[PDB]
Amino acid sequence: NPYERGPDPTEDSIEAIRGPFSVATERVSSFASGFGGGTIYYPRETDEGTFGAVAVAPGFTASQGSMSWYGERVASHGFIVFTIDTNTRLDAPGQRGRQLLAALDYLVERSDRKVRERLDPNRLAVMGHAMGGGGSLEATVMRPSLKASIPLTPWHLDKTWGQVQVPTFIIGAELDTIAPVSTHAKPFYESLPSSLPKAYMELCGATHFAPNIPNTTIAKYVISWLKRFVDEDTRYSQFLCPNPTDRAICEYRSTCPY
């Protein structure tokens, strides 16, 4: 596997606040075409090969600040992280899906050479919080060539996603009453194709805003899903299959083995 980056993982090494790669950043003007700009976090070491990329969208009326902690956390494990702002703070889930693809296209076509030369433009993912999570599902319908999708406590009015072809990892919050898992996160996951590689993780006692503050249980398995599907790295299947039993997890569902 030519996309394998970093040493062989352990349960502690995926919980590490800093991975094996150092992080540099680039700021992108809000007048970039198709999205509201953002901050790119990328690994600085080039001697192991180029990296895949994930665009990170925020929720309704939120900004990249609410998703900022993913930046260094994930990119230090060998990914290019693009925390973006939306065109307006009121953008709908469909609008946030189009803007996630616009951010990924900016990385490929127009990003700074320091970023371009570290990027594998064929290995791209999407991630989003709340309405940005509903945008992550919309992004995979709009671009089924993406490698992974991670809706965090997602909110969407449309509950059926039976045509999704991108490995999707949904994270729900037990005490979410803004996008309750019983009418949002769980219906989305169960509607995903039975054959798709997918997973659902419900955090115990978590609120709708748990993705906005550093969370090891979120971090360790966001990194595992991204390595497993953006890097095709089967060294991270051990963490995902069989289903994790972390004390922080109150409900886990998957289509293991993968």
User: Using CB under 5 A as the criterion, which residues of the chain lie in contact with Ca ion when the complex forms?
Assistant: 32
**DSSP-derived pairing of the beta strands 168-173 and 148-152:** parallel
Q: Which CB atom, from 107 or from 173, has the smaller least distance to ligand A1L0N?
A: 173
Instruction: Using CB under 6 A, count the residues that bind ligand A1L0N.
Output: 8
| Those residues with Cβ within 8 angstroms of residue 122's Cβ, 6 or more apart along the chain or in another chain | none
Asked if 80 interacts with ligand A1L0N (CB under 6 A), we say no
How near is the Cβ of 233 to ligand A1L0N at its closest, in Å?
A: 31
Per rule CB under 6 A, is residue 69 in the interface with ligand A1L0N?
Answer: no
CA distance 210 to 173: 7
Q: Could you say whether residue 59 binds ligand A1L0N (CB under 6 A)? A: yes
Rank residues 84 and 185 by Cβ distance to Ca ion and give the closer one: 84
CB of 67 to ligand A1L0N, least distance (A): 10
Look at residue 222 and give its three-state secondary structure: helix
Structure tokens at 3: 């996309």
CA end-to-end span of the chain: 16
Considering only 3, 42, 155, 221, the residue that binds ligand A1L0N (CB under 6 A) is 155
For the CB of residue 170, give the shortest distance to ligand A1L0N in the complex, in Å.
Answer: 14
CA 73-76-82 angle, to 5 degrees, is: 70
What are residue 51's DSSP bridge partners? 119
Place of tokens 């509950």: 159
- The reply to whether 130 sits near ligand A1L0N by the rule CB under 6 A is yes
121 CB burial (10 A radius; 0-12, 13-18, 19+): middle
**Calpha distance 113→126 (Å, rounded):** 22
Question: Is residue 62 part of the contact set for ligand A1L0N (CB under 6 A)?
Answer: yes
Burial of 243 from C-beta contacts in 10 A (0-12 / 13-18 / 19+) = middle
User: Which of Ca ion, ligand A1L0N, none does residue 178 bind (CB under 5 to 8 Å by kind)?
Assistant: ligand A1L0N
The residue range among 37-45, 59-67, 142-150, 167-175 that interacts with ligand A1L0N, by the rule CB under 6 A, is: 59-67
Beta-bridge partners for 27: 39
- 142 scored as a contact of ligand A1L0N (CB under 6 A): no
CB of 35 to ligand A1L0N, least distance (A): 17
Instruction: From the list ligand A1L0N, Ca ion, none, pick the one residue 218 interacts with, judged by a Cβ distance below 5 to 8 Å according to partner type.
Output: none
